[PDB]
Amino acid sequence: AFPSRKDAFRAQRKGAKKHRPEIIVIDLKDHVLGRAAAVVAKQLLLGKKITVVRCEQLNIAGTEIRNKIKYLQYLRKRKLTNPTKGPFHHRAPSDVFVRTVRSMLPRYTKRGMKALNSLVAYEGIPPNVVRTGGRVVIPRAQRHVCYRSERPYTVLGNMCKHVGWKYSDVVANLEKARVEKASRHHEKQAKLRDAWKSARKEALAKMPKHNVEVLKKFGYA
Amino acid sequence: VKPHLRHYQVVGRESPSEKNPEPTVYKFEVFAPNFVVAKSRFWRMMRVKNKVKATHGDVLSCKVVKDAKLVARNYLVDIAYYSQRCGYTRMVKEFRDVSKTGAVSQAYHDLASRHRARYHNIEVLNVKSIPDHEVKHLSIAQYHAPNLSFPLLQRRTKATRKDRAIFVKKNTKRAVVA
Amino acid sequence: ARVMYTVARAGQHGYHHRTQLNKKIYQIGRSVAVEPNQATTTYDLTAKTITPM
RNA sequence: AUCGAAUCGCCACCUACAAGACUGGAGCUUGCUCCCUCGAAGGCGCCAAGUAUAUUCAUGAUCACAAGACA
RNA sequence: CGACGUCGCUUUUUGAUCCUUCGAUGUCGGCUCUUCCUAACCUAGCGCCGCAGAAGACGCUAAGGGUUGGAUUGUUCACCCACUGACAGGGAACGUGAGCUGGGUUUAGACCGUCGUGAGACAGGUUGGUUUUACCCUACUUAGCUGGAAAUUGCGAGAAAAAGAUUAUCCGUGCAAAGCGGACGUCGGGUCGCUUGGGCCUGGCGAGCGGUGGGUAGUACAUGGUACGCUCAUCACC
RNA sequence: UUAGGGAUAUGUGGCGUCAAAACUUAUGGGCUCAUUCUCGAUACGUGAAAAGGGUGUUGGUGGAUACAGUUGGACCCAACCGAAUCCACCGGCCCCGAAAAUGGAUGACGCUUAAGCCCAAUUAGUGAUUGCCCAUUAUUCCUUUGGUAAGGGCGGAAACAAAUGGAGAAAGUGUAGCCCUUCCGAUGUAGAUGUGGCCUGGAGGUUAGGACGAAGCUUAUGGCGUGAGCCUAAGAUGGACCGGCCUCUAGUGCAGAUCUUGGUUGGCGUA
RNA sequence: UCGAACCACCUAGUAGCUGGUUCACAUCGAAGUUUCCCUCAGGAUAGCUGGUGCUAGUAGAAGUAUUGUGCGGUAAAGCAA
RNA sequence: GGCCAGAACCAGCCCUACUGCAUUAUCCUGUCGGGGAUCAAAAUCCGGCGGGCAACGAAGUGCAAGAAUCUUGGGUCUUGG
Ligand SMILES: [K+]
Ligand SMILES: [K+]
Ligand SMILES: [K+]
Ligand SMILES: [K+]
Ligand SMILES: [K+]
Ligand SMILES: [K+]
Ligand SMILES: [K+]
Ligand SMILES: [K+]
Ligand SMILES: [K+]
Ligand SMILES: [Mg+2]
Ligand SMILES: [Mg+2]
Ligand SMILES: [Mg+2]
Ligand SMILES: [Mg+2]
Ligand SMILES: [Mg+2]
Ligand SMILES: [Mg+2]
Ligand SMILES: [Mg+2]
Ligand SMILES: [Mg+2]
Ligand SMILES: [Mg+2]
Ligand SMILES: [Mg+2]
Ligand SMILES: [Mg+2]
Ligand SMILES: [Mg+2]
Ligand SMILES: [Mg+2]
Ligand SMILES: [Mg+2]
Ligand SMILES: [Mg+2]
Ligand SMILES: [Mg+2]
Ligand SMILES: [Mg+2]
Ligand SMILES: [Mg+2]
Ligand SMILES: [Mg+2]
Ligand SMILES: [Mg+2]
Ligand SMILES: [Mg+2]
Ligand SMILES: [Mg+2]
Ligand SMILES: [Mg+2]
Ligand SMILES: [Mg+2]
Ligand SMILES: [Mg+2]
Ligand SMILES: [Mg+2]
Ligand SMILES: [Mg+2]
Ligand SMILES: [Mg+2]
Ligand SMILES: [Mg+2]
Ligand SMILES: [Mg+2]
Ligand SMILES: [Mg+2]
Ligand SMILES: [Mg+2]
Ligand SMILES: [Mg+2]
Ligand SMILES: [Mg+2]
Ligand SMILES: [Mg+2]
Ligand SMILES: [Mg+2]
Ligand SMILES: [Mg+2]
Ligand SMILES: [Mg+2]
Ligand SMILES: [Mg+2]
Ligand SMILES: [Mg+2]
Ligand SMILES: [Mg+2]
Ligand SMILES: [Mg+2]
Ligand code: NA
Ligand code: NA
Ligand code: NA
Ligand code: NA
Ligand code: NA
């Protein structure tokens, strides 16, 4: 992952500025696992670079016990003669989502592999993703519009924690620290947000009046 | 949606002959998707009741009876359906609807859902609008209250087709991918 | 139609890393240059080091 | 330094959080009434640093990867 | 527990069939070794009893672990002796013969009984009777070398990193606060263009933080070999 | 149900991803929750399940009671209290009944405001009766080929040199088909037949080539033919024969018969 | 080399059985059934198929209807016939 | 130029936008009475009687032939010029 000295030297020779590819960051909290994965897989095949965060807060319909049992049935499948080379049962929730997307992809083609490698999965929100830009959601894969609220539902992090995932507490503490840092920084800059809001308000009295009338016509003033 | 079953009146008779110089004329009410199905049901009923085949009969008329003005009503639908296990089972149900065709179409949907009865094993004995005080089921009479009011909860409001999006920002309306 | 990994086969024996539990320490002796009587106890008063003859 | 490339929206206002059986706020009458910023916009950017007194654009000749691209 | 009836499951029995194999798929049993199944013998829990206790019956969840030594028989099977918490039933080409063994079954020698005029016959008895080949490919067991994220290429740029003249233009501390604490100077030259006490290279002096080498004293540590004070020379930041 | 192709429509089956289509359609209605063979989505496929049972939920049928039934007080029996109850039976979905041996299968993922089951629609109480996606099928267009094929033309109309409109026009089974127009069929084992269909050695005729290079041999040498094959180009190949056409003729076409002979070859620098 | 040695020849012995059987395109295109056979892994023989045609191209046409006119004893029904 | 590409028109096809006839009575209205439910109404519902066109963007009911010329639809790299 570390760039080669040749690549750093070429970048210095060209004098190019810092570059970031067009990447969509999806917050997977309260998102249905299969519906989000199907949507993500289609977008990956269409050529989008997608990074998903908070994978541990994905949701699966039904009780946690039956979802844990379903994974345990998946875990029991292994090549008897040689468990190495057998199915690799990843426990991390981000790895669970990646496997679900992978099964929805044609993983045995170069095109399918390119789509799969265009996806990055995280538990929680890592610092390199926090400040990159506004996160997105999938409206047709959201719990509050997909599940009937009476039905019990499973949280992916809780399901994974009891089937082998060992970093549930680490992710929870990191998420707690991140929200506290974000809340403090959002408590700050409120004066900046309020000042800009008042600046826009005062602009109406200083700008040409026919321009105001156009704004009122199109519902902006 | 508008009902999928139209109200048909089929008037027919056995073709005149020497034994029956003036055959009796029969009028039939049926709820069918089209007039071809309506004539088929009429000739079936003539065969099983009046012993008259379509090959020896005439169809005087087959016309749709229009629905009345749409008013929230209570319809008493007397219906029957066949099953191998139980033979002919007849029930009298009540529905809330605005038309005879809507109430009958609702009854057919109810029979399919709750008894796995298809259209061709169902016979509609009668259907009529009934007053509020003649309704027996509380699930129907609960809509007769003068102050019926309730909120709209657990609703999945889907945007207009042109404005639907795949990826939208978390707390905005800005479509990232549409 | 395979040989299972659970079947005994010839190969390397020994030179394996092992973690062995509950080895009681019986003595923590000092350097012989600091205290020559390393193997001397209060019951056996012979002046001897830990190194055997 | 080969190297000519495909990509074509920027931000130090989105880039914090949570809830969709309900988070603008009250009242009691508990589904209605009242108050408000009136509950259906993240901000900019799209050719005069701003809505005016303006201003060089050609012959790259009628489409052709924008013949350029650090916003 | 369950007559008279009746509804099923299982393929650890035989049968029925003849689809595959007759230019051949080595045919019994045992030994050895691994794994799987649960209709659970022991072991872990738990109901129920014509469960007082003790010893037991029946049932539930559960196959993680365990399930023997011998006499006779080629035997599978059977039976007996003995130990035991228990000595549960099965599958894996009736697991397993280029793994073995060859007692049996199934050639050619020979004996007996019965059968046949006879040559000969008998899921009747008997005795004797060659068990071949791996150096190939996979699998497994270990043992070496070595590329590679566009999984060999694109130059195709995504950090579980930092947080700002767009990461450039210092370093600590603090909550992405409010603030607070620090920073080697000076005299010249040369070269290029946000004009801001401009960027870069470089020279002469004087400091500081240091590295190395020599001298010199106390001290620590396992006590030959490093560290620390002071003092010289030198190099680096410069 | 099948000549070589294009376009447009369909059939069966589908429209959450894999995977074209509802970028998870509707401004359609109901039902269902199923914990270790993991509910269900299995036409044919019986390609896996029954008798029996359920106070899981959702529907029907027929009766009985009501100031009830259930509590609480008292005195099995009657009185308080202030609602609707109760008994019998029959469906739908779900559940129990339901135990096998490598780890595994609605095809996989997954799906439960279904992406499950039953029914019903095509942008929806608005104003009319084709949502969308996939064929060697249908319609239509171009081309080939063969017909039990259908027709027309074939007595050169006239005129016209080069320097500076053209070419052809055969009375015809079959060819580079005499030319043009038109219609229909076109797959196929065993098998039959046809081919101015291809190819090989030799003979009778005819017409050519070759020391300025014959045969043979070589090919990222192209061209032509649906094809068998033919022809040209190059040889920094070869060194003396040989091509086309009509007819005749035969020891006349190879991928494999544990085929014959010769050579080679992985195993192998191995045992 | 022996439950009939070896050599050459008759001998390319015979085989209803096994294996093989060399270019292209085009028009058509099956049968596993009947009868007889020491017949049952084979044949003859009809049928199916190709080729050649002949005859005055709707003549003696039809795996189909309608009408008229015949034939029947299976499904049902019956045991009070 | 016998190459590549874009626009024009021409003919033929292939998709569309533009709609009339018939029908509607178990219907539409007004009124009287009943019946209903309210704090009181109204409505749903049943009769008698009087009027009728639910009315052409009324009805998702039967059939539609409406010259892409008037009024310059789209496609043809799916055709040939
Ligand atoms: K054996
Ligand atoms: K012998
Ligand atoms: K012996
Ligand atoms: K639905
Ligand atoms: K049942
Ligand atoms: K022709
Ligand atoms: K000819
Ligand atoms: K061949
Ligand atoms: K070799
Ligand atoms: Mg909700
Ligand atoms: Mg360019
Ligand atoms: Mg019994
Ligand atoms: Mg057989
Ligand atoms: Mg055999
Ligand atoms: Mg063999
Ligand atoms: Mg073998
Ligand atoms: Mg069990
Ligand atoms: Mg066990
Ligand atoms: Mg085990
Ligand atoms: Mg067996
Ligand atoms: Mg065996
Ligand atoms: Mg052997
Ligand atoms: Mg073996
Ligand atoms: Mg033996
Ligand atoms: Mg023996
Ligand atoms: Mg024998
Ligand atoms: Mg690379
Ligand atoms: Mg790169
Ligand atoms: Mg897939
Ligand atoms: Mg798709
Ligand atoms: Mg849906
Ligand atoms: Mg099936
Ligand atoms: Mg299936
Ligand atoms: Mg079935
Ligand atoms: Mg599954
Ligand atoms: Mg499927
Ligand atoms: Mg409509
Ligand atoms: Mg053919
Ligand atoms: Mg010859
Ligand atoms: Mg070659
Ligand atoms: Mg020959
Ligand atoms: Mg050859
Ligand atoms: Mg011969
Ligand atoms: Mg034979
Ligand atoms: Mg053969
Ligand atoms: Mg044919
Ligand atoms: Mg044979
Ligand atoms: Mg009978
Ligand atoms: Mg009878
Ligand atoms: Mg009788
Ligand atoms: Mg018109
Ligand atoms: Na067999
Ligand atoms: Na026990
Ligand atoms: Na077929
Ligand atoms: Na075709
Ligand atoms: Na043709």
Side-chain angles (χ1 to χ4, degrees), chain A residues 1-3 5-6 8-16 18-21 23-186 188-221, chain B residues 1-18 20-178, chain C:
Chain A
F2 202 98
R5 302 211 300 193
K6 150 181 198 153
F9 189 16
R10 176 170 176 289
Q12 186 213 108
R13 290 206 299 277
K14 293 289 186 161
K18 317 215 172 72
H19 177 279
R20 183 173 166 80
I23 297 162
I24 300 159
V25 188
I26 313 180
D27 185 8
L28 279 183
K29 176 195 169 68
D30 322 291
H31 278 78
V32 181
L33 168 62
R35 310 202 171 249
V39 170
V40 162
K42 203 63 200 63
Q43 290 304 298
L44 290 174
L45 284 167
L46 289 170
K48 302 289 197 310
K49 294 180 164 51
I50 295 169
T51 292
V52 295
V53 292
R54 303 220 266 179
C55 286
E56 81 284 359
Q57 295 182 69
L58 282 154
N59 291 140
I60 317 171
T63 58
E64 196 208 78
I65 165 67
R66 91 167 272 130
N67 290 125
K68 285 197 306 282
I69 283 187
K70 274 195 287 186
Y71 192 92
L72 288 173
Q73 282 289 110
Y74 161 62
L75 174 60
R76 108 192 298 281
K77 275 139 194 65
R78 64 161 199 171
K79 172 151 196 173
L80 171 75
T81 58
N82 203 356
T84 90
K85 305 158 184 303
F88 309 123
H89 320 93
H90 289 69
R91 318 304 168 80
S94 66
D95 289 350
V96 167
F97 180 75
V98 160
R99 190 221 158 189
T100 317
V101 174
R102 188 183 63 190
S103 304
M104 273 145 199
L105 286 177
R107 62 178 299 193
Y108 303 120
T109 65
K110 284 206 177 77
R111 164 189 173 246
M113 271 333 266
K114 185 184 315 175
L116 178 57
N117 286 317
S118 288
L119 171 75
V120 177
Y122 291 113
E123 284 107 9
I125 310 195
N128 64 306
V129 174
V130 156
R131 292 152 71 142
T132 50
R135 261 94 64 181
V136 314
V137 294
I138 316 174
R140 76 198 65 187
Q142 280 183 298
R143 170 162 68 76
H144 83 279
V145 311
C146 283
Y147 300 162
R148 300 289 310 190
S149 303
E150 286 77 38
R151 307 287 184 189
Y153 67 94
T154 305
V155 182
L156 185 51
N158 300 145
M159 197 214 75
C160 290
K161 154 196 197 333
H162 295 130
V163 304
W165 186 42
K166 292 185 290 179
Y167 299 98
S168 185
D169 273 321
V170 173
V171 170
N173 287 325
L174 287 180
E175 268 302 275
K176 173 176 186 322
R178 182 206 59 103
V179 172
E180 258 143 41
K181 181 182 183 176
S183 160
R184 282 189 312 260
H185 183 74
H186 184 89
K188 308 166 193 169
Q189 310 264 131
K191 266 151 170 283
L192 176 65
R193 286 187 311 262
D194 287 17
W196 270 121
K197 277 210 237 216
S198 74
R200 278 193 283 287
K201 210 184 264 263
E202 301 196 26
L204 298 179
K206 265 94 147 63
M207 75 189 269
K209 274 47 172 64
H210 64 280
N211 281 340
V212 182
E213 274 319 78
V214 176
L215 287 185
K216 305 229 265 276
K217 170 188 179 189
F218 293 111
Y220 286 102
Chain B
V1 274
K2 279 172 168 175
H4 74 284
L5 296 183
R6 289 92 161 131
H7 192 178
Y8 283 94
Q9 190 193 60
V10 196
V11 179
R13 66 167 187 183
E14 151 167 304
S15 282
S17 66
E18 69 297 307
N20 200 348
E22 229 299 320
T24 300
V25 172
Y26 300 82
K27 301 196 322 272
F28 185 55
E29 271 170 306
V30 64
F31 295 87
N34 51 70
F35 77 91
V36 182
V37 170
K39 284 146 102 100
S40 182
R41 301 301 286 182
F42 169 75
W43 282 127
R44 176 196 179 252
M45 191 61 37
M46 290 262 296
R47 199 225 322 129
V48 302
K49 295 270 301 199
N50 312 135
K51 221 165 186 184
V52 179
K53 320 283 265 302
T55 55
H56 317 87
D58 324 285
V59 176
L60 301 198
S61 70
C62 176
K63 230 147 49 173
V64 160
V65 193
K66 63 157 119 193
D67 269 310
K69 279 190 170 176
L70 305 190
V71 171
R73 281 177 267 246
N74 329 294
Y75 289 96
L76 194 62
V77 179
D78 190 350
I79 217 158
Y81 77 95
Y82 176 91
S83 63
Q84 157 146 234
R85 202 174 165 79
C86 301
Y88 276 110
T89 279
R90 177 205 166 239
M91 46 192 72
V92 191
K93 306 199 67 167
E94 310 137 350
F95 297 88
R96 290 280 300 175
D97 215 273
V98 297
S99 56
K100 282 190 186 177
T101 51
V104 169
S105 294
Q106 208 192 133
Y108 271 87
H109 290 326
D110 178 285
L111 256 47
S113 76
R114 308 192 202 250
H115 306 284
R116 308 311 157 135
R118 327 288 141 114
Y119 170 90
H120 282 284
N121 300 314
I122 293 165
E123 268 164 302
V124 174
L125 282 87
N126 210 262
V127 49
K128 66 155 139 55
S129 187
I130 62 173
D132 277 347
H133 71 272
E134 271 167 26
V135 166
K136 323 270 64 153
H137 296 115
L138 310 148
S139 57
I140 302 301
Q142 56 176 355
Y143 295 102
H144 305 164
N147 64 22
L148 179 61
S149 70
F150 43 88
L152 295 187
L153 303 179
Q154 290 197 61
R155 60 207 323 253
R156 200 209 182 121
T157 284
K158 297 188 187 171
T160 335
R161 177 164 181 73
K162 302 199 315 332
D163 322 81
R164 88 191 181 286
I166 296 178
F167 295 145
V168 188
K169 278 196 178 174
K170 187 168 173 61
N171 301 295
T172 89
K173 307 286 139 102
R174 305 252 300 242
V176 168
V177 173
Chain C
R2 264 159 292 147
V3 180
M4 290 207 246
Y5 79 104
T6 54
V7 181
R9 317 280 286 158
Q12 166 77 27
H13 190 224
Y15 198 74
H16 309 306
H17 187 271
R18 295 296 184 253
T19 304
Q20 315 129 76
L21 289 203
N22 296 340
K23 306 293 186 166
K24 282 268 288 195
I25 306 171
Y26 271 11
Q27 186 185 39
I28 304 210
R30 291 257 258 137
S31 280
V32 62
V34 176
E35 188 22 62
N37 305 6
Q38 309 179 294
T40 304
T41 67
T42 66
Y43 311 79
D44 180 25
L45 295 177
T46 314
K48 26 198 262 183
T49 80
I50 204 61
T51 305
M53 305 150 63

